Swiss-Prot record, chain A:
Superkingdom of origin organism: Bacteria
Entry annotated with the keyword Transport: yes
Keyword Ion transport: yes
Sequence intervals crossing the membrane: none
Gene from which this protein is expressed: atpC
Keywords (A to Z) from UniProt: ATP synthesis, Hydrogen ion transport, Ion transport, Transport
Name used for this protein in its record: V-type ATP synthase subunit C
Family: Belongs to the V-ATPase V0D/AC39 subunit family.
Disulfide bond residue pairs: none
Any one GO cellular component localisation term in the record: proton-transporting V-type ATPase, V0 domain
């Protein structure tokens, strides 16, 4: 098993993470100067073309070899712990894959990177012609996200529903396993991920007339059914009573964009102070949030530069 | 030996050591078990502010094993 | 002990040593196993709020062991 | 046999220490084993309310080993 | 025993070996427990300040075990 | 052991001492091995609903270890 | 044993040998209990500077575990 | 040589004690090893549902060490 | 012991065993406290060079334990 | 290794105990060393069918501790 | 002098066990304590070569426990 | 005893039994450490097919301890 | 004792038992540190050759611990 070698491999990698002062420089640059800067970094090391499709691809391929190769390098008890983190990036691939089989559209225009399910699992799944067979091919790597899929697929074959019940059931699955793999660092974070999900499920489905109890799943810290119901009526006075959590910063805010920005920045923060717990999954935890967030800012800074958008429209979203 | 006197030679004392093994092992195990419940407690306090009580009761449960075992020990290592 | 502790002999000291492994095994095993389940249990009452009772039946499982070790401890006592 | 040095000489005492060894190591191992299975079983009950029986039949398997050891020993140290 | 002169007992020396086990293991265990609640407490403040009280009530519980152990050692050895 | 109260001797006593360690450690190892396989095994039985028989046969293999330690420990006592 | 001066009887020696087990096992327990809260404790400051005090006050509590183990040892050793 | 202490006295006594350690430890290292391979092995049967044969053989490889230690001891005390 | 450099009694050798434990074990506990907190301190410097000190003050606290072991050994071998 | 008279003897026992240790201890270290690497490594072949040759050469490096201990053990306690 | 022999003695052997605890246990705590620091040290040099000095000072730091333990063993064993 | 000693008997035999503990513990630490890394190391070989070797050499490094310790016991147990 | 060319003696033999504990434990701690760091060193060279020298220096550091445990051990036994 064991994170002893694996943590060590990641510590060398934390050396080539992009510090805050790069994005600071990049805003001052035009697209031509941005491109010269980008090539110094490790995302730059996969670059294959000046234009936009190529920037999206260099970023993605950097994430595929430095982050998406982690579950293979461990096994067992190590592997389950690392796997839960990786699983969110796999769910994104799965939801798109499930949707290409079902609505008959090509394999293309989806997210592919390795994680827990390999590239070949997604190709064999795609080519499967019965949803049940599609499901056994997915169940081969082993993970809680299969077991979550399997139960939802028994109730339904409707696209929109499978998507929602899979996500709900999946975070519930994740939580139980994670609580049983211990460590304070992971527990604090898990709580925030669920709390953030809860808020966020409420925002995405806002005003659809639905049940507010459906947007609250266990794992919480301070949020409950009533806050959800008020929130659903359109009242944001609930967020103004929400303190003692690091979402203290959501108070007095009522725009969906500022609210959701806020949750992603909070989750970033928890993970960045998990490096005072680098033992076990703590360090990897911090490493994945930072590679993800970094990749996102280079894509936003590249878009902002190419189309000559307003600076303040993106300067605020590239810092927490 | 006895739980209230200094009577006994070597024979009686050997009995003391042997009964002493129950108290050590049991105490060892009750201590490790309380720890799991204690950490588990973060979810109980976090999620619901009424299921903090369930956790209070849980920490109380491994202690029951040690105090009963210890009672057998005190008695039989307290006979004439 | 065997049938004494304060007028006891060396034969009884063996019974004492043996009894110590037996209580030690009961308290240790059941306590550690019980805590695992109690710990898991927080999530089980939380998620499966109607089926809280299921988690409690689970908790009962190791208890069979703590009573068996004691039984043995009792058996070993008052034997030659 | 029974512990001795002046209540049945060296001969009797050496055997006595020897037989106790088995029960101590086996008992250590068996305490841990129940915990690993019980922790696992909660995931099962959560998922399906037909797999409670499968966790129980698992919980029971390592119990046999120490109680079989104990029974053999019991014969051996219940006699002269 | 006493530090002063007012005790003697051949039996008591054997009682000291056997009792050293119980205190030592109870402090080991109580400590391991204590830590889980204390790390959990870090989380409790983080989650909500007002229910620092929840960390406090659970945290009291492993203390009982060492404390209990200290009294058992005094009764068995050192009472006179 | 075959003999341990059906014959006395220093000679026997030693054989119990050396060979006693061998079964106890084997009995320890079977428990931990069986348990682990079972703990991981709950996930297999849950998911695979027609590949469940494979988990059961694999779970049976550590039993061999305990029988091996016990056969050796038996023969050598009471002499080969 | 003796407090002042080294032991000069075999009985005094034997008590010393037992009493050591309690201060050793405790000493170890203070150590493990400090580490989980201590490592987190830096994190306390980090997250919230104002509640640096909250982490320390938890860490202090395992120091108690050693002093309680010493006091039993300090009294018991002086005489037999 | 054999394990005795009256078919060779004090000279013999040392062989019997020392040899017991080789077997006892052979048994500990094997026992724990079996658990690791078992734990990983579950994945392999789930993944490839017809590569059942691969998991069983990998597991067999630690058994080799107990057959090695347990025989060596047996041959040597088999001389007499 | 207090008297031991090149010869000494059997008795003196026994106080040296028991007291030896107390210090050795403190060093052990210090190292476990240090491992966790030390490792955390490497995170802190990495992030910000200037708050090497916070890590250092938290770390300074398990040193106290090693010093506590010394004093137990010192008093009990023979008072200054 | 061998048992005979010219690979046997009382003289041979003193050699046999020491040399016997050498296989046991080498066996201990080998079982744990080999297990994790072998657990993961058989797994690789299950996943990726181009690591099987690598896994076999890799596997023998932890096997080296038992093979080493075995050469010492065999030669010294051979014939003459 | 401090800690020496040339002739050995029966007294010395018991003295030897006692002094052996201190170095052995301290080094075990030094080894683990370093090991964790050592893992974290890869990270310190990696982020910045302006914390690289800090990483060296952390690494030197767990040595103090082992050095301290050498000293306690020499002092106790060479004071009259 | 050995083939490079010509001092056997009860005297060589105590030393052989006793010194045997050291190699066994050196093997234990070596064992646990080689295994964890070796498993992660499979992924290393998997990645580097031209620098596969590096992984192989890192495995060899803990073995250095076990073997070094055997050679030290060899000197001690026979130097003629 | 002695280590000039032999160490035979029942008395010396006692010293031999005592020291091997200290070697054992010191060697055990070395195993965990050296291996983990050595794996960590192979990752450092593979990503960046600008940290190839740090990786090498870290490997050496745990070697001192195992030698300390040998040196004390030699010292009590007749010196170097």
């Amino acid at each position: 098993d064991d994170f002893a070698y694996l943590n060590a491999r990641v510590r060398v990698r934390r050396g080539t993470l992009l510090k805050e002062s790069f994005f600071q420089e990049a805003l001052d640059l035009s697209f031509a100067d941005f491109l010269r800067l980008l090539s110094e970094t490790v995302y730059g090391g996969e670059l294959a073309g000046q234009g936009l499709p190529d920037v999206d691809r260099a970023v993605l391929r950097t994430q595929a070899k430095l982050v998406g190769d982690l579950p293979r390098l461990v096994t067992g008890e190590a592997r389950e712990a690392v796997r839960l983190l990786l699983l969110r990036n796999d769910l994104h691939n799965l939801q798109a894959l499930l949707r290409a089989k079902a609505t008959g559209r090509p394999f293309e225009e989806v997210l592919l990177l390795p994680g827990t399910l390999r590239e070949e699992v997604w190709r064999q799944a795609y080519e499967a012609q019965d949803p049940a067979g599609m499901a056994q091919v997915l169940a081969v790597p082993g993970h809680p996200l299969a077991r979550a899929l399997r139960a939802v697929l028994r109730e339904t074959q409707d696209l929109a529903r499978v998507e929602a019940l899979l996500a709900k059931r999946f975070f519930e699955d994740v939580a139980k396993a994670a609580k049983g793999l211990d460590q304070p660092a992971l527990r604090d974070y898990l709580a925030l991920e669920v709390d953030a999900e809860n808020l966020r499920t409420a925002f995405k489905l806002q005003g659809s007339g639905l049940a507010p109890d459906a947007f609250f799943l266990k794992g919480g810290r301070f949020v409950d059914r009533v806050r959800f119901a008020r929130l659903m009526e359109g009242d944001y006075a609930v967020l103004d009573e929400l303190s003692g959590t690091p979402f203290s910063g959501l108070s007095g805010v009522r725009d969906l964009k500022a609210l959701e920005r806020g949750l992603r920045c909070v989750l970033l923060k928890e993970a960045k102070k998990g490096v005072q717990d680098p033992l076990g999954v703590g360090l990897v935890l911090a490493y994945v949030k930072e590679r993800e967030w970094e990749a996102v800012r280079l894509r936003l800074l590249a878009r902002r530069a190419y189309f000559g958008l307003p600076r303040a429209q993106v300067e605020e979203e590239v810092v927490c | 030996a006895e739980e209230a006197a200094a009577s006994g030679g070597l024979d009686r004392g050997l009995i003391a050591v042997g009964m002493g093994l129950a108290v050590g092992l049991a105490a060892l195990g009750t201590g490790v078990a309380q720890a799991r419940i204690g950490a588990a407690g973060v979810g109980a306090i976090a999620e619901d502010r009424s299921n903090f009580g369930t956790a209070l009761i849980f920490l109380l449960l491994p202690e029951t094993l040690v105090i009963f075992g210890l009672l057998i020990a005190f008695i039989l290592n307290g006979r004439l």
